[PDB]
Symmetry: D2
Subunit: 435 residues, 4 copies
């Protein structure tokens, strides 16, 4: 009641502990106001204007409510006041590392710009979180409220990215193992992160959200399973869960995998690439970095947001003329044309993403072709497709898609790109159809 | 353009919105797509995290609602002579009404420009007229208008009049279809599709409920003769719906638009724009260079003027921008101007746009009752100016008619000493410029 | 988690303590399934089919959530596990005493049938609650879970009806005074009872419900005010409260005061009256009671529900022919015709309700009348119209309508009833208009 | 009946519903108003307290949706020759489709009547036809039909066919408007306004969300030629909406309609009706006396047969009703039949309506592997029978076509000894009548 309250459209009023407020009001956190949640989705769904910032607030809030709910119903667990804060901090900072247009950056751009590099936004989040506390002297404030930084910061990072190095976690002992299933749950993909963006994306997409997370948390319990401590749902809650997965399927099919949405995101990527050489971002020690290299220094990365889209678009510099023209095509709605899609029966690896258009253009279609295509005329889009145990009332504590687009939009040539593609699919024997 | 073959855009408020190809042609332009880059509530976003929405989706909504209103009237009252041409012209009017808005919306024409160019009289509504002209000229929309049966010389004027008013005063349409001018912007009773959309839209993002059901209201809407003039009438039963709209508007103004911290942030951003104006160049027509404040004079530069300017100052390295850049960071670090108080000129004269620049000086020159260990210059004061009839029909007689200013003060110095000093400069200034004694 | 869960459309899942379940599964509680919430409103609003039963569950649930929320945030209050149950029981049973078509019964019918009698449904609730525990042996079960019946039952009754006899309450001491503001709050009309039926009636009427009760309870605090302990709202919650009152105004104006709705309810009352003599309900000791007398014996009253409407309607008995014809008029939608409405500047007392039609018909309108009316041709409907202190963040713990309808529906005579009415209003100088 | 002068009824699902005077005349009858007194989900109410809604409001909804569908088609596809007369006939069909339902809805025709009169083949759909005939005859609706341009002999048949099917098989309308028969009741693909309404309605009261947007689906609905037959087609883009409807139906069947306790209660009430049938008299035509089970033979008695019969047994003093009355109290006291188990005849033959009476006897006659200290008669067993293609069009080619049984067992004796005894009678009976081994 001495805390901060932020009014939220999804969760209503979210009360924020002073320590969380201190972290949020920094350049490194406020940065997330400037990155669209659904990336290019906005250019298909006008309601999807929401950014990573409000999402981060949501996951942190939900993070806090889960730990708190469990601890009261099971004092056995030895959940400390310190633990609750640490889970909340993990929730708030889990997406700190996302780049321009979110999943476009680490999912396509960086692979294309630096196939060499193994990079995900989660490690960005770890790196950016470390940068945040040092730049703003959060560690004293952490100590002030009863947290021990050496132990807890490790815990915080582990909740986001997983084990940093029989029991892999250095930040917390096995007896509070259930904490690591809260913010990021790899072991079935059930956690508060996704609960939030479901409700959140649905709200902004005008899609009904099916899963009642308030209820699920209320009935949530910690049970022993295979002599490991983990979070378990009431038997009656299965219907709720059937339903969460159905909301998920709807979001992935209608929104995240949208044909035009993904095209636009690849156009933006193509634009970033022809601008990469000429754009300068100032990092630590006044050093100069490019878009693709900005991930190497967290000072520079902080200033890398959706802003780069407009900065390229508004630029007069003729070095950027090539990049600028693509973005202008988006405005005029002259977009890459959709050729087709296929799935492999093994999956394409991201270090292979760069190599793919050459392969597509270099195939030899059986049928004679009226016009021939270079590799520069193809865009190939790699779209990656993504148990639970229960407890009973009467007895508690017992249990890839690949698209190809063509840059040329005349009818005759569009039919050329067609045949290169059908051949390419067949000859790396990915599936043969469709019509 | 045969029905059912249109483009459909899915919207969280209105559901699926159908777009005539001509509307689509206007939408798919740099001048239109620009609104994707301007936040609806401006600095409001920094208080309400759900209020991330931009002018773009709002404008689409008003265009859609515009269409639903005239179409509904035309179908149930054929005497009115509502043409498909009229329908399109009303939709285009709805769609482009906010084209002229600048960075952070109302912050721009409502505060910045008055502060930057006090002699100039400028509103975003006339911006919208200018930008619409630039849009149709740059992209050759006029042939397409003719293509679908519109007469550009006559209709473009109609479109502009529906937005900003008369340039019988209206040249764009005859008096016999006068009721059309009550759809997009209704000056008399303030009930129109513009208000309807942003009421519902802002509510959605603010997590505020909307009690006005516009779908219903349009269904029962009628045009009747009033004082020998044609006007839009609501069924008597719809009064309850109207009670709800005004309560929604009252809540939004009091809870959201007049929010203290929201407005503080809006003034800080304005303060930042001012000390940056000299050093920032935007390229206009003929390659000419303009500044933020002069960009409204040339639509070519203005097209490239959006919320982007906030981040540009922010990300800037130039030490000329050191004064501005540091202020924006205070926003990031959440070290903001502190709220001293509020007062109203009740029964008195209202501050004029030509006097905004002059206001902080007057405040700083006051004579505080007890003298303070701290004395404050004019540069440390901020003064914020916040600015605050239906005819019916009954069923049995379907065509017969029936029937503030706030000023706040913030201080740039929030050290304990200056703050209570800042208190009495304000209280004294209020006493001596005839405002209510603050509380 | 060993409790019962009932799924509710307004509140979601409501968990019920075993003791509450024991009380609910009795003829005396289950009775409320058979009484419509809005009475004659259903015949205007097809969505308002809901009954007192589900409403009672709601108020009990909300009752429990308020006490529980306060006790955790202020352990100072000395709220016992026993107290929480007692507030919940009060919530669940507060409407036990309502009769057929709810407010029609005690608000019009009983006054007309027995003007002599001073009767409200709240005392019914007290009487019916007492009858419930004795008939079903609840007192042992009460003792079983740690309740002391002599002390607590008094507390329970006091929360519903007020003081039974400086400090008026015998059931609880002044230091837990705040408990009496939860289920029924006379001292500003702010309590959980109304919170529920707002949300509930709104849901079924298709009216938006403005008040967020979940939030209000979350921020609710107990403060000292005028050296009496009472419940206080956060300063920020004023906007929420402005809003509760606006929802209230909407419900009263659009629904509860509906012109046709009230007419129908008076028609039903008129029907009950001409049936009252001939209908037999079996009470204690096999004794026979009538509709108006059924309130005297709780055994008989238990079997008095909306059922009486259909029993009259379906009857063959010619003694009931007079009553039956009125009900049949409702089906054919031949209803009392609306003459007009007025308010007094002093209010009509319910012991005077019976006397009113005689007065209306006996006036002498200045203008000459073409047809004259008996008292039997008039229906006069009496519709009764219905501070808060706060606390701050930084410093906790510091602060009648009267309608006249006419039974005859020809144009000439309808205009007669008109003039009797205008005269009657003027000559007991209630307001003169309207047009 | 000029538009905008109709009667409007406010509905929680559809908002305001407009009613043509002819529809109103039908609605304001004892035969129609009767549905106010029959619970939609029957015994479901005793598990879901929010499910208090009755057949009345549901029927109004289907009538409204019926109107929205044909009207939408008629406006966007004038070739189809949809008349205002057709519109009314479809609305009346929608409105009266559930007239024939009895006490607790599906409990009556789905369980009771099979148990009470096993030789008789009866569904509420044919009830609806009978009751509609009784309605129009008793209240002289036929002149009013003629009054608004309807031809009673031709149209009343059409109305009946839209409900129960053929009495080209349809005499009520020619093959050229065949698509009309897919609106109220669609037998082939089960997508119609009936399902749409009660999906949305039940969801509202159960606190279950509805993912099918019917407002949208109707907007984009089209009639196309399919196999040289006229049928209703959805736009290809609407597939996602359809994914949502079926998931809603799947949830409702699994979560609500097939609820264990709900169904148990439905069988107890049925059990109560049976032992009361002999002693209860309902007055039919010519003053003749009928019982509950025979009331379906005469519409005069049936009009007075509603959920009221539940309370009548309950409130009854007659000791003849002692057997029934005590059962209902077990419901009040919540002492219910206990659930033994469930099994399915997967890949096997389905229980026939003529065999329901015979089923408990077969169960009781089984030979349990170990003999029990408790032995059970047939009167102590209850067996419950629970019973569980779209063409599209694409925008660029607007008129070209594209493309279980459960049986449960409950026991009336729930003493610990009888219950585990009851267990193996069931498991053995299942083994020896070829059902799945229970789990
Ligand atoms: N044209 C256009 N569509 C938008 C916009 N915002 C959202 N959308 C939605 C509407 C349709 C969807 C895809 O439209 P596109 O023009 O990109 O692609 P398309 O609809 O397949 O093109 P086409 O109609 O020629 O087949 O995106 C916008 O600003 N302009
Ligand atoms: N268009 C596009 N969408 C992607 C890509 N990769 C993932 N997505 C979408 C699909 C579902 C969604 C998954 O979101 P997450 O569960 O990872 O949650 P998040 O908030 O977005 O990120 P995080 O995991 O760090 O919390 O992201 C991509 O490469 N391109
Ligand atoms: N501090 C902070 N507040 C935010 C943020 N986003 C939205 N808000 C809303 C929630 C509360 C509201 C308070 O604004 P302030 O930070 O200026 O706090 P304050 O008004 O000066 O003081 P107080 O602590 O009493 O609220 O702003 C954010 O990122 N940081
Ligand atoms: N705090 C604050 N609120 C403002 C200011 N100017 C306007 N508002 C409020 C009043 C109504 C609300 C929305 O403005 P409008 O009603 O004019 O609607 P609009 O769509 O935003 O602009 P337009 O009139 O051009 O259509 O914003 C301002 O300067 N400060
Ligand atoms: N006629 C009728 N109206 C209903 C029914 N259910 C709800 N309503 C609503 C619709 C209108 C409202 C009042 O209708 P009434 O016929 O009782 O009174 P009225 O509408 O003022 O009559 P009138 O139209 O002649 O002025 O009640 C119903 O079953 N029949
Ligand atoms: N038609 C009609 N409505 C009435 C009458 N008296 C009261 N009402 C309505 C107006 C508002 C509503 C008030 O409900 P309450 O606050 O009393 O709550 P309740 O659940 O209905 O009863 P209780 O007070 O016992 O809890 O009842 C009446 O005499 N006639
Ligand atoms: N006991 C009871 N349950 C109700 C009532 N109203 C709705 N329900 C729902 C909520 C839970 C569900 C359980 O029904 P039962 O009472 O038969 O309980 P049960 O299924 O036999 O056993 P269990 O305690 O495990 O749920 O019924 C009610 O008034 N009393
Ligand atoms: N548990 C249970 N559910 C049933 C039974 N019969 C039907 N149901 C379910 C299946 C669908 C659901 C609603 O029935 P319908 O789809 O037939 O729609 P309706 O409006 O109720 O009746 P109608 O077909 O006459 O329009 O009720 C039954 O006997 N037992
Ligand atoms: Fe996330
Ligand atoms: Fe606007
Ligand atoms: Fe109540
Ligand atoms: Fe139906
Ligand atoms: Mg504050
Ligand atoms: Mg498309
Ligand atoms: Mg159960
Ligand atoms: Mg009316």
């Amino acid at each position: 009641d001495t805390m901060k309250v932020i009014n939220d459209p999804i969760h209503g009023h979210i009360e924020l502990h002073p320590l969380l407020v201190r972290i949020i009001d920094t350049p490194q956190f406020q940065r997330l106001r400037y990155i669209k949640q659904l990336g290019g989705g906005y250019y298909v769904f006008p309601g999807a204007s929401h950014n990573r910032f409000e999402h981060s607030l949501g996951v942190g809030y939900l993070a806090g409510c889960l730990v708190h709910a469990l601890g009261e119903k099971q004092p056995e667990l030895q959940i400390s006041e310190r633990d609750v804060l640490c889970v909340q901090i993990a929730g708030l900072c889990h997406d700190l590392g996302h780049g321009p247009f979110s999943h476009m950056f680490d999912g396509r751009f960086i692979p294309l710009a630096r196939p060499e590099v193994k990079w995900t936004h989660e490690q960005g989040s770890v790196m950016m979180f470390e940068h945040l506390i040092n730049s703003n002297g959060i560690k004293p404030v952490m100590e002030q409220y009863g947290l021990i930084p050496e132990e807890d910061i490790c815990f915080i990072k582990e909740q986001i990215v997983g084990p940093l190095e029989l029991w892999p976690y250095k930040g917390r002992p096995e007896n509070k193992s259930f904490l690591y299933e809260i913010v990021s749950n790899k072991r079935n993909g059930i956690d508060v992160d996704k609960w939030d963006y479901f409700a959140r994306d649905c709200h902004h997409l005008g899609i009904q959200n099916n899963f009642d997370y308030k209820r699920f948390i209320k009935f949530a319990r910690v049970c022993e399973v295979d002599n490991e401590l983990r979070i378990c749902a009431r038997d009656k809650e299965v219907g709720n869960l059937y339903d969460m997965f159905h909301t998920r399927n709807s979001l992935h099919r209608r929104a995240y995998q949208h044909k035009v949405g993904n095209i636009i995101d690849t156009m933006i990527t193509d634009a970033f690439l022809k601008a990469d050489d000429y754009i300068e971002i100032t990092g630590a020690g006044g050093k100069k970095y490019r878009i693709s290299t900005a991930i190497d220094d967290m000072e520079a990365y902080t200033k890398l947001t959706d802003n780069i889209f407009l900065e390229i678009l508004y630029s007069t510099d003729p070095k950027l003329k090539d990049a600028r023209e693509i973005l202008k095509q988006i405005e005029y709605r002259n977009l890459f044309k959709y050729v087709g899609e296929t799935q492999p029966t093994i999956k394409i690896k991201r270090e292979d993403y760069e190599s793919l258009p050459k392969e597509v253009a270099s195939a030899k279609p059986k049928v004679l072709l009226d016009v021939k295509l270079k590799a520069e005329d193809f865009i190939v889009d790699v779209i990656n497709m993504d148990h639970v145990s229960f407890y009973c009332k009467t007895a508690p504590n017992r249990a890839q898609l690949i698209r190809v687009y063509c840059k040329k939009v005349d009818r005759k040539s569009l039919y050329a790109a067609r045949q290169y593609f059908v051949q390419w699919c067949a000859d790396r024997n990915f599936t043969k159809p469709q019509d």
